[PDB]
């Protein structure tokens, strides 16, 4: 009925956390510290950078200057107006994201103790709220020091994930990884509101699609409705279910509420099925449930959300990634990107969702695996995936490694798992839950998480857990999930990440040796001075595929983005080429989350790399490609000519018609082995629209200037 | 620093009433007998030193200790407060308490013990005052504590006493076929006062990944956990030294970036550990220390002696397995280890004599009986 936003200007007081962590308002107010203006939603580093206290962490080695703030406390404080509350109503203080361990006070009375940054936190402050200035104080403590309140196991020490990330329920990447820096941060990184709920209100409206006949345009939809209902209102409230789309109404059913919980089945007709991108249209229908008084007609509560009639089944073969996704009874080919943090300062994730989802739209992704090292993306992210048709492989927030087997951690994880599943179990894009782990004796992945899916979501499957070398071309993994290859970003990105005296990668002009500023942007978690490491993967790829190092920085940028473009394009062409057997490919990074060097095909500030346009041409719904020659076309749709030619000589290698069958890899013809290092062009037209592709044949090492002119004469790309 | 609180205490014993005495007032107001006790030690030794009981090792004098199983035991002593700088933590370590007991320091309860088989550490930094401190422990009847639980069908009728099932004590103390019914009670191990700097090693778990006795090399991993204040991060180094007979073999220094780290070491010129017969029991002094990188002050040290060995039980009916030590199948020949004394506080004086019995007989294995 009412939702007052508490976002805006707050008062942030930060100070070094003493030996005894500050828990009460009296200790935080009596402590010596610095007070600045804060913005909610927002990270504490953003509020300090707005006051000139810290320098830009996005440039140079300044990310290491935010190290002492990891042991700091953060005191948010403001005052709010109290909305009028009638008899029976409840006033809920809703936090969307508390990072992380904080004590919430309303008028000096502790109303909650938050210990998780990945789920929401609701506190009924109906009794403690007074009239006039209502004080709201949130006192956060250090997440690093909280890791010492536990005793870790042997299998929880030495993994890729930080040992500080094991006992706490935070995003593992916020501590350091390979494609994200160490920015732990803190603060109300999501919306803070004041919700008012009537005595008759909807607690949860869970939509589940039972049957779908996409041909006859029929579907059966069930509604598990749980409502709070005083007994005096029993037999006096009715549930109004309305299914609509584009303004027109399809179904309207009313039922008198005799119980607080009911299951309403709906045999809908004239509705369309929600198919992933390529195999159909993302048909969404606005579903609305309202609790209306049967006499006065007053609406007590209303929940509106867009649903999609779809069924998901994972057929796993095991020994005999050996699984295949089945949507609406049809085997689909999964081709998409793994979603990584959109920002180390996660409060700014909301402003990047709209832009980053469109990157998958232009890529024609039909699936996206949200990486376990990342925070749970909010509802608006999954809403865009419902709108376009991009299936979601949501991993539970746990990093590369194992966790505690005791009751304390398992209980804290079940609270997070329940809150997350109930929040996202109503989106047709979400197709699978996973633990991101290693084994079959792990309580976390085989018991705690599996039991939550067993009770709160029995519809989605759950799972506990040179480039032409035989490591890639002979890997018998039907469904690959983490394929990557390094690539240097654009020049405009380099000029903004590094200081002017460090834009050039080479130290003292010695090629292969990186300066310290390039070493830090290669995701160096700590300030450990060393030579080589991860950046040597960029030189190793340029040397093998192009001969040696291009001293010219622009020549090195072109060489690095070409060894990444040709590699991962060959990977998509290989999985789509061996389609009958291969089930899907999900490459790594389509948009990173910080000024850094990574395997991504696009940087943080929006600079799309050459691998973006390369993989676009091998991601159409109908794509013709060449595999080691064999010209074949792969079709990723349910709907049933080509010209190959050398770029240099211009001789027609092959021309003719083709019949690409639906959801099938149709081979065309075997092309003769052309001698000499060259390049082919694959021009094919379907339904009057033209498309282009290419295939680089031969054997490395190549010549950078020759390859630069092959693609120039090709006409596609720069 | 670790000041030992072992020595002469003051023990007061009395029959346990219907409501077990759990406070220092009820113990000081009850009707009992006050004698001098020795810590570490059992209550039967303290009463035997005052003629209250006869020698249970002679004849049928063991049954004459039966009425004491329903008695309570009140230990008391005074200790001086060690010098504690701000930031340090004073811990009261108990090597063993038999069993259910309530610990008090300066009148304030500092913990409740419920197990005789494990240690008990209590942070008594705030309660310790300046000067005459007082430590009072009050043990209750371990036999009567079994009646606070409802047993199942399978927990009755076994050779182990039904009194032993709902409690965590040694099952042989209630009588077996090879050891007497001397339940006993008391602080049967060391009682000390450890000091802990703000930077102190919590655990140093050594693990042998792989071993190569022929090449005289082995991969030794160290899993280190420590309490490190954030104001001390990036300012303390960990010194790992693996020596043998005053001959250093490894010296690795690493800056403490995190609070928990895995330090994988690749030793060179080191012998593998072997049981009796299959070689020499090669031991190496493995010492870790947290030293300030600026002041050079050492905060905490954890020294021990490890051995580069690997174990792997090879299975195929009870007994269908063989131990594989360092890749070779070994034939085990040894004895079962039973209690060294019904009054287990004297086990420290018998361990050196009893182990010599195995060395003399050349046993390669010993199964410590449950």
């Amino acid at each position: 009925v009412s939702e007052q936003s508490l976002n805006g200007r707050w008062t942030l007081k930060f100070f070094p956390q003493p030996a005894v962590p500050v828990m009460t308002i009296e200790g935080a107010e009596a402590a010596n510290g610095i007070v600045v203006d804060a913005v909610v939603p927002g990270n504490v580093e953003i509020d300090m950078e707005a006051a000139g206290l810290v320098e830009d962490p996005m440039v140079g080695n300044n990310i290491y200057k935010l190290r002492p703030y990891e042991g700091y406390q953060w005191y948010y404080s403001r005052t709010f107006a109290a909305p009028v509350v009638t008899e029976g109503q409840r006033l809920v203080l809703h936090f969307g994201g508390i990072d992380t361990f904080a004590e919430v006070y309303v008028n000096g009375i502790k109303v909650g103790s938050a210990d998780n940054m990945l789920i929401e936190h609701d506190y009924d402050i109906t009794s403690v709220v007074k009239e006039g200035e209502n004080r709201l104080d949130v006192i956060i403590r250090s997440s690093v020091m909280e890791a010492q309140n536990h005793f870790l196991g042997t299998l929880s020490i030495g993994n890729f994930s930080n040992e500080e990330s094991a006992p706490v329920r935070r995003a593992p990447s916020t501590y350091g990884w390979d494609i994200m820096p160490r920015l732990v941060s803190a603060g109300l990184w999501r919306d803070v509101t004041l919700r008012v709920e009537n005595p008759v209100t909807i607690v949860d409206a869970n939509w589940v699609t039972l049957s779908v006949n996409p041909k006859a345009r029929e579907a059966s939809e069930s509604l598990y409705l749980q409502t709070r209902l005083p007994f005096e209102m029993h037999d006096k409230v009715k549930a109004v279910i309305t299914i609509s789309r584009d303004g027109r109404q399809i179904l309207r059913k009313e039922a008198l509420m005799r119980k607080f919980a009911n299951l309403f089945t709906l045999n809908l007709s004239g509705v369309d099925a929600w198919w992933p991108r390529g195999y159909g249209e993302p048909a969404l229908y606005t579903a609305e449930v309202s609790l209306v008084d049967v006499t006065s007609g007053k609406i007590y509560d209303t929940k509106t959300s867009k649903i999609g009639f779809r069924t998901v089944k994972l057929e796993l073969d095991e020994v005999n990634g050996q699984f295949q996704f089945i949507i609406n009874g049809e085997p689909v080919f999964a081709k998409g990107t793994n979603w990584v943090p959109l920002d180390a300062l996660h409060s700014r994730d909301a402003s990047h969702v709209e832009e980053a989802v469109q990157l998958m739209v232009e890529m024609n992704c039909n699936i996206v695996r949200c990486w376990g090292g990342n925070v749970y993306e909010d509802t608006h992210f999954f809403e865009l995936c419902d709108k376009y048709g991009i299936m979601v492989w949501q991993d539970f927030a746990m990093g590369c490694g194992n966790y505690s087997q005791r009751d304390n951690f398992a209980a804290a994880l079940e609270k997070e798992a329940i809150s997350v599943v109930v929040k996202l179990r109503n989106h047709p894009s979400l197709i699978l839950w996973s633990g991101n782990n290693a084994p079959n004796n792990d309580r976390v992945s085989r018991q705690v998480l599996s039991r939550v899916i067993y009770e709160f979501d029995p519809t989605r499957p759950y799972l506990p857990s040179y480039y032409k070398d035989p490591f890639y071309t002979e890997n018998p993994s039907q469904f690959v999930s983490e394929i990557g290859y390094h690539g240097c970003p654009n020049r405009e990105t380099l000029e903004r990440m590094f200081s002017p005296d460090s834009v050039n990668p080479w130290q003292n002009g010695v090629v292969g040796m990186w300066n310290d500023e390039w070493q830090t942007k290669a995701n160096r978690i700590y300030d450990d001075k060393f030579q080589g490491g991860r950046n040597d993967l960029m030189t190793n790829q340029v040397r093998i595929i192009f001969g040696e190092v291009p001293a010219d920085l622009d020549d090195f940028i072109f060489a690095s983005q070409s060894v990444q473009a040709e590699a991962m394009k060959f990977f998509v062409e290989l999985w789509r080429g061996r389609r009958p057997y291969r089930t899907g490919i999900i490459w790594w990074n389509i948009r990173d989350g910080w000024p850094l060097l990574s395997d991504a095909i696009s940087d943080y500030w929006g600079g799309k790399k050459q691998a973006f346009y390369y993989m676009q041409n091998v991601h159409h719904d109908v794509c013709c490609l060449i595999n080691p020659y064999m010209l074949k076309v792969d079709n990723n749709t349910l709907k049933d000519v080509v010209e190959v030619k050398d770029v240099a000589s211009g001789k027609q290698v092959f021309k003719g018609k083709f019949v690409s069958k639906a959801n099938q890899m149709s081979e065309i013809a075997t092309l003769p082995m052309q001698k000499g290092q060259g390049m082919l062009v694959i021009s094919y037209r379907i339904e009057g629209n033209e498309y282009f592709n290419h295939y680089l044949y031969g054997e490395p090492p190549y010549k950078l200037d020759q390859y630069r002119k092959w693609v120039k004469k090709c006409g596609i790309y720069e | 620093s670790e000041q030992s609180l072992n020595g002469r205490w003051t023990l007061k014993f009395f029959p346990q009433p219907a409501v077990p005495v759990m406070t220092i007032e009820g113990a000081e107001a009850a009707n009992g007998i006050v004698v001098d006790a020795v810590v570490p030690g059992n209550v039967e030794i303290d009463m035997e030193a005052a003629g209250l009981v006869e020698d249970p090792m002679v004849g049928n004098n063991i049954y004459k200790l039966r009425p004491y199983e329903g008695y309570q035991w009140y230990y008391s002593r005074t200790f001086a407060a060690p010098v504690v700088t701000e930031g340090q933590r004073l811990v009261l370590h108990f090597g063993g308490i038999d069993t259910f007991a309530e610990v008090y320091v300066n009148g304030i309860k500092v913990g409740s013990a419920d197990n005789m088989l494990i240690e008990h550490d209590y942070d008594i930094t705030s309660v310790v005052k300046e000067g005459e401190n007082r430590l009072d422990v009050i043990i209750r009847s371990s036999v009567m504590e079994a009646q606070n639980h409802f047993l199942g069908t399978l927990s009755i009728g076994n050779f182990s006493n039904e009194e032993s099932a709902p409690v965590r004590r040694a099952p042989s103390t209630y009588g077996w076929d090879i050891m007497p019914r001397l339940v006993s009670a008391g602080l049967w191990r060391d009682v000390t006062l450890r000091v802990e700097n703000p930077v102190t090693i919590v655990d140093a778990n050594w693990v042998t990944l792989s071993v190569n006795p022929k090449a005289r090399e082995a991969s030794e991993s160290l899993y280190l956990q420590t309490r490190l204040p954030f104001e001390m991060h990036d300012k303390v180094k960990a010194v790992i030294t693996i020596s043998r007979d005053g001959r250093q073999i490894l010296r690795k220094e690493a800056l403490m970036r995190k609070f928990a780290n895995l330090f994988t070491l690749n030793l060179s010129g080191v012998d593998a550990w072997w049981p009796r017969g299959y070689g020499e029991p090669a031991l190496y002094t493995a010492e870790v220390s947290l030293v300030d990188v600026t002041s050079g002050k050492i905060y905490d040290t954890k020294t021990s002696k490890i051995g580069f060995r690997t174990v792997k039980l090879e299975l195929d009916q009870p007994g269908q397995f063989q131990f594989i030590i360092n890749g070779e199948p070994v034939f085990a020949k040894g004895t079962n280890w039973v209690p060294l004394d019904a009054l287990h506080s004297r086990d420290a004086s018998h361990v050196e004599e009893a182990v010599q019995l195995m060395v003399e007989m050349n046993c390669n294995i010993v199964r410590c009986w449950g």
Side-chain angles (χ1 to χ4, degrees):
Chain A
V1 56
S2 304
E3 185 163 4
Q4 172 187 350
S5 182
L6 286 78
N7 296 331
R9 182 258 190 181
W10 288 56
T11 297
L12 213 174
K13 173 178 182 177
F14 60 96
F15 49 84
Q17 176 172 336
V20 185
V22 178
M23 297 285 294
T24 57
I25 310 175
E26 304 95 289
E29 290 180 339
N32 59 316
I34 305 301
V35 179
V36 298
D37 288 352
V39 173
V40 172
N43 293 89
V44 295
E45 288 77 16
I46 304 179
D47 306 325
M48 292 185 300
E49 186 176 357
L53 298 179
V54 304
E55 299 167 0
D56 185 7
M58 293 182 149
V59 60
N61 295 10
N62 293 9
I63 180 61
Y64 301 150
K65 294 189 179 63
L66 303 178
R67 168 73 164 179
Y69 297 102
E70 305 175 355
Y72 267 63
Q73 292 193 233
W74 316 95
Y75 177 31
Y76 284 81
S77 59
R78 72 155 299 176
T79 53
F80 62 94
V84 62
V85 178
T86 69
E87 261 287 341
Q89 289 182 345
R90 312 190 308 116
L91 185 61
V92 181
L93 176 55
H94 168 73
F95 286 92
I98 302 182
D99 182 0
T100 290
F101 303 95
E103 309 291 326
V104 186
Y105 289 89
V106 174
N107 293 322
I109 299 179
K110 174 179 297 182
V111 303
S113 301
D115 57 76
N116 200 321
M117 74 161 291
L118 312 167
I119 57 181
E120 307 173 0
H121 295 321
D122 302 349
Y123 311 109
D124 179 290
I125 58 177
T126 310
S127 57
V128 301
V129 155
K130 69 177 189 62
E131 308 86 22
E133 293 183 357
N134 295 269
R135 303 173 305 177
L136 177 56
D137 303 321
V138 180
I139 307 180
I140 317 180
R141 51 183 175 270
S142 167
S143 301
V144 176
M145 300 303 300
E146 276 291 327
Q148 300 170 39
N149 299 335
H150 306 67
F151 183 86
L152 296 180
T154 300
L155 301 181
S156 191
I157 303 180
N159 307 332
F160 206 116
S161 304
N162 203 284
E163 287 80 11
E164 305 161 359
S165 184
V168 305
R169 301 304 303 114
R170 307 181 67 260
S173 67
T174 59
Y175 280 103
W177 215 268
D178 59 353
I179 279 135
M180 204 59 57
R182 180 186 181 67
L183 199 29
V184 280
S185 85
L188 318 177
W189 68 284
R190 277 185 172 174
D191 296 325
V192 183
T193 62
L194 256 185
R195 302 172 177 176
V196 180
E197 302 176 3
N198 289 326
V200 183
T201 184
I202 302 177
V203 177
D204 173 83
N206 169 244
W207 297 91
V208 163
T209 315
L210 185 138
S211 76
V212 190
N213 195 281
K215 340 292 166 188
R217 307 181 71 250
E218 298 175 346
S220 298
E221 190 81 7
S222 295
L223 171 66
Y224 296 88
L225 183 67
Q226 299 189 23
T227 62
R228 268 175 33 236
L229 184 66
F231 190 80
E232 59 176 5
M233 298 303 302
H234 279 51
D235 305 350
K236 293 297 182 177
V237 183
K238 64 176 183 178
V240 179
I241 307 175
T242 305
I243 309 298
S244 64
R245 179 180 181 181
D246 297 358
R248 69 200 305 178
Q249 177 177 126
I250 293 90
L251 193 273
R252 175 181 176 88
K253 180 182 179 182
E254 297 181 12
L256 183 63
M257 299 285 290
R258 297 183 152 292
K259 325 176 277 278
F260 77 105
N262 307 265
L263 170 59
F264 305 103
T265 173
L266 304 177
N267 294 331
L268 292 139
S269 299
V271 299
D272 296 327
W274 188 95
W275 290 87
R277 193 169 194 85
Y279 301 85
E281 71 175 37
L284 295 179
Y285 286 78
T286 293
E288 192 178 37
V289 184
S290 296
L291 303 179
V292 184
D293 198 325
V294 300
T295 54
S296 58
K298 173 182 174 59
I299 298 182
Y300 288 130
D301 189 58
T302 299
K303 257 56 186 176
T304 305
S305 58
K306 296 186 180 62
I307 65 178
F309 309 114
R310 64 99 185 92
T311 59
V312 54
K313 174 191 174 183
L314 187 67
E315 170 52 52
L316 51 93
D317 202 11
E318 289 158 308
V319 173
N320 240 28
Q322 276 67 36
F323 45 83
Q324 177 76 97
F325 283 105
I326 280 81
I327 301 299
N328 306 331
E330 300 295 332
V332 300
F333 187 80
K335 50 174 194 301
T337 168
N338 295 280
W339 192 276
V340 299
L342 295 175
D343 203 321
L345 301 169
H346 287 267
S347 75
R348 303 183 299 191
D349 288 1
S351 61
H352 301 303
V353 172
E354 291 276 357
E355 318 179 43
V357 174
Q358 291 294 82
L359 299 180
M360 301 187 302
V361 177
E362 303 169 358
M363 187 50 64
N364 197 76
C365 299
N366 54 28
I367 192 178
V368 47
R369 172 177 165 268
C370 300
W371 175 54
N374 178 32
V375 299
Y376 296 97
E377 299 290 340
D378 216 337
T379 301
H380 189 61
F381 166 82
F382 290 78
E383 286 172 347
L384 295 182
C385 297
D386 299 322
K387 174 185 177 181
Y388 297 136
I390 314 174
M391 303 180 302
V392 183
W393 177 335
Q394 183 62 46
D395 291 353
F396 283 114
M398 287 182 301
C400 181
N402 294 81
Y403 291 87
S404 178
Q405 307 292 280
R406 289 155 287 179
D407 284 3
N408 287 117
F409 179 84
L413 186 70
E414 186 193 29
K415 171 182 169 58
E416 170 185 333
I418 290 182
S419 180
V420 166
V421 167
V422 179
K423 183 178 182 178
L424 285 315
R425 62 185 187 184
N426 298 321
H427 294 141
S429 56
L430 185 53
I431 63 173
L432 185 142
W433 297 95
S434 182
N436 186 57
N437 256 359
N440 310 304
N441 296 353
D442 181 56
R443 182 193 181 183
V444 168
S445 61
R446 285 287 183 175
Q447 179 187 103
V448 179
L449 297 179
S450 60
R451 199 183 304 270
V452 175
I453 302 298
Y454 170 72
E455 188 178 2
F456 296 97
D457 193 8
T459 66
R460 294 175 181 82
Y462 172 78
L463 294 179
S465 178
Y466 200 43
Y467 57 95
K468 301 181 184 177
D469 285 355
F471 173 70
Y472 304 94
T473 188
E474 302 186 25
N475 187 26
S477 295
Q478 291 181 334
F479 202 104
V480 74
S481 58
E482 295 185 19
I483 278 183
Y485 223 57
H486 264 273
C488 179
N490 296 1
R491 155 169 283 273
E492 185 179 1
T493 310
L494 298 177
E495 301 174 355
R496 196 179 178 181
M497 298 190 302
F498 311 104
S499 58
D501 290 355
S502 299
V503 185
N504 198 271
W506 317 125
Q507 174 82 333
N508 303 332
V510 184
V511 289
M513 301 291 99
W514 313 90
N515 71 321
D516 202 74
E517 286 209 1
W518 275 64
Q519 293 287 92
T520 59
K521 261 55 174 59
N523 296 256
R524 197 177 63 176
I525 301 177
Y526 295 105
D527 200 1
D528 306 332
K529 308 299 182 179
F530 77 102
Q531 182 57 223
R534 182 174 177 85
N535 271 334
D536 289 357
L537 294 180
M538 285 193 296
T539 45
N540 166 78
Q541 297 166 182
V542 175
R543 292 182 312 162
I544 298 180
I545 212 65
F546 280 145
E548 202 37 57
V549 39
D552 183 65
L553 179 52
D554 293 355
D555 295 354
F556 169 76
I557 293 174
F558 174 79
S560 299
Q561 297 187 20
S562 290
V563 66
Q564 179 190 359
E566 291 281 352
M568 288 163 58
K569 164 180 172 297
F570 173 82
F571 291 139
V572 179
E573 290 179 330
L574 183 57
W575 253 254
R576 296 186 62 175
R578 304 177 295 188
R579 168 98 168 243
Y581 169 80
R582 302 298 166 179
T583 59
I585 167 178
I586 305 183
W587 70 88
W588 192 274
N589 239 99
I590 198 182
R591 181 200 174 297
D592 70 59
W594 197 258
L596 57 75
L597 310 147
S598 67
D599 308 295
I601 76 181
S602 154
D603 55 69
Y604 172 80
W605 288 304
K608 306 171 187 175
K609 306 180 188 180
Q610 296 298 325
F612 185 85
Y613 317 104
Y614 271 62
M615 301 181 69
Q616 271 182 321
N617 285 325
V618 301
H619 260 270
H620 298 341
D621 302 327
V622 182
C623 170
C624 301
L625 47 91
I626 294 179
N627 284 122
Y629 313 100
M630 194 43 164
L631 176 71
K632 33 190 171 174
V633 55
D634 182 66
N635 189 16
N636 291 309
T637 70
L638 307 182
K639 303 166 292 184
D640 284 331
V641 309
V642 60
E643 171 169 1
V644 186
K645 179 186 59 179
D646 183 53
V647 186
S649 64
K651 178 186 61 60
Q652 289 190 3
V653 187
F654 185 85
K655 280 196 61 179
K657 304 157 56 182
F658 63 92
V659 181
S660 181
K661 301 179 181 181
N663 200 79
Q664 184 175 349
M665 188 279 302
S666 300
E667 293 179 340
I668 312 304
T670 54
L671 306 186
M673 200 287 300
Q674 282 195 336
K675 183 259 180 180
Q677 299 181 2
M679 184 174 297
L680 299 176
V681 285
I682 316 171
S683 300
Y684 53 99
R685 284 173 281 271
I686 291 92
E687 294 180 349
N689 298 271
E690 92 292 333
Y691 306 96
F692 301 101
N693 200 18
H694 77 275
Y695 177 80
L696 177 136
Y697 63 97
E699 178 70 20
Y702 285 86
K703 310 308 168 187
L704 185 62
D705 296 330
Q706 293 293 321
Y707 173 84
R708 182 170 173 85
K709 304 310 295 174
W710 295 350
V711 296
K712 169 57 64 180
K713 298 182 298 181
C714 277
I716 45 199
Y717 321 129
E718 204 198 301
Chain B
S1 180
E2 184 171 358
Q3 180 184 1
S4 178
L5 298 188
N6 298 328
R8 182 184 65 91
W9 293 36
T10 305
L11 179 58
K12 174 181 180 179
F13 46 93
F14 49 84
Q16 168 163 317
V19 179
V21 176
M22 304 184 185
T23 60
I24 63 176
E25 300 90 7
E28 290 181 342
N31 172 81
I33 304 178
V34 180
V35 300
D36 289 356
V38 176
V39 177
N42 295 92
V43 298
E44 276 83 358
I45 305 177
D46 305 323
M47 301 182 301
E48 187 180 7
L52 274 304
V53 299
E54 294 171 319
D55 186 13
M57 305 159 61
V58 177
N60 290 24
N61 303 338
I62 178 63
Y63 302 99
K64 312 190 187 309
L65 302 173
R66 165 74 161 180
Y68 291 101
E69 304 173 354
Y71 272 60
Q72 295 192 203
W73 317 93
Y74 177 32
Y75 283 90
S76 293
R77 76 153 294 169
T78 55
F79 61 96
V83 181
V84 180
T85 73
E86 192 179 26
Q88 297 180 357
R89 282 160 51 173
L90 177 61
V91 180
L92 175 59
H93 170 266
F94 287 103
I97 305 177
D98 191 355
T99 295
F100 302 96
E102 312 287 307
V103 187
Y104 285 88
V105 172
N106 296 312
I108 299 300
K109 174 178 296 181
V110 300
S112 305
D114 63 349
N115 200 328
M116 73 170 299
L117 314 160
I118 58 181
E119 297 172 335
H120 303 277
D121 303 338
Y122 304 134
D123 190 9
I124 55 173
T125 302
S126 60
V127 300
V128 162
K129 68 174 189 61
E130 309 178 17
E132 180 207 21
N133 301 265
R134 195 173 69 174
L135 172 57
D136 300 330
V137 193
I138 300 178
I139 310 180
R140 51 183 174 270
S141 173
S142 297
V143 178
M144 292 304 301
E145 275 284 326
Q147 296 171 37
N148 306 334
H149 313 264
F150 179 85
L151 307 184
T153 297
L154 302 180
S155 297
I156 306 178
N158 311 325
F159 192 86
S160 60
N161 202 291
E162 289 88 3
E163 307 176 344
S164 181
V167 302
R168 286 283 76 202
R169 302 182 68 261
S172 72
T173 50
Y174 290 105
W176 213 267
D177 52 13
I178 52 108
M179 271 274 313
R181 183 173 183 114
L182 191 39
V183 167
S184 195
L187 310 180
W188 64 289
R189 276 180 172 176
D190 302 320
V191 178
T192 54
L193 284 174
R194 303 168 174 173
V195 300
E196 295 180 351
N197 287 327
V199 186
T200 297
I201 302 178
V202 173
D203 179 82
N205 171 224
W206 300 85
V207 168
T208 303
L209 265 55
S210 56
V211 65
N212 193 340
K214 312 177 187 62
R216 300 187 68 248
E217 288 174 341
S219 296
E220 185 70 19
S221 292
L222 164 142
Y223 296 87
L224 191 68
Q225 306 183 30
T226 174
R227 181 172 65 252
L228 178 66
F230 194 85
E231 51 262 36
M232 220 65 59
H233 279 42
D234 302 345
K235 304 177 187 64
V236 173
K237 59 178 182 179
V239 183
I240 314 178
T241 59
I242 291 87
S243 59
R244 183 177 179 181
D245 299 356
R247 166 178 158 265
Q248 285 199 5
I249 309 189
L250 188 133
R251 163 63 80 96
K252 172 173 292 298
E253 293 187 359
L255 192 52
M256 293 276 87
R257 289 278 193 243
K258 299 168 294 185
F259 85 104
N261 279 260
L262 164 59
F263 291 143
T264 294
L265 313 178
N266 287 324
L267 282 305
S268 300
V270 292
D271 306 323
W273 186 93
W274 294 96
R276 293 196 67 88
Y278 292 91
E280 188 184 31
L283 262 54
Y284 290 83
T285 294
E287 163 174 343
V288 198
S289 304
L290 298 176
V291 187
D292 198 320
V293 304
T294 300
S295 62
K297 174 185 177 182
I298 307 181
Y299 290 139
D300 186 71
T301 59
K302 295 300 180 183
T303 76
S304 63
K305 299 175 182 176
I306 61 178
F308 304 97
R309 56 93 199 178
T310 63
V311 64
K312 176 183 298 181
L313 197 63
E314 181 197 7
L315 306 147
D316 285 11
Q317 205 264 308
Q320 304 299 95
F321 53 86
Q322 182 177 11
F323 288 98
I324 298 184
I325 305 299
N326 297 3
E328 296 282 352
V330 296
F331 182 89
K333 41 178 182 179
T335 181
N336 296 275
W337 195 265
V338 298
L340 292 176
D341 206 326
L343 303 171
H344 293 263
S345 73
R346 298 180 296 194
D347 290 4
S349 66
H350 297 297
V351 58
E352 305 190 28
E353 314 180 33
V355 167
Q356 184 63 33
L357 296 181
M358 294 188 300
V359 183
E360 291 176 0
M361 189 162 328
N362 192 61
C363 304
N364 65 9
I365 208 167
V366 49
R367 172 180 172 266
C368 293
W369 177 51

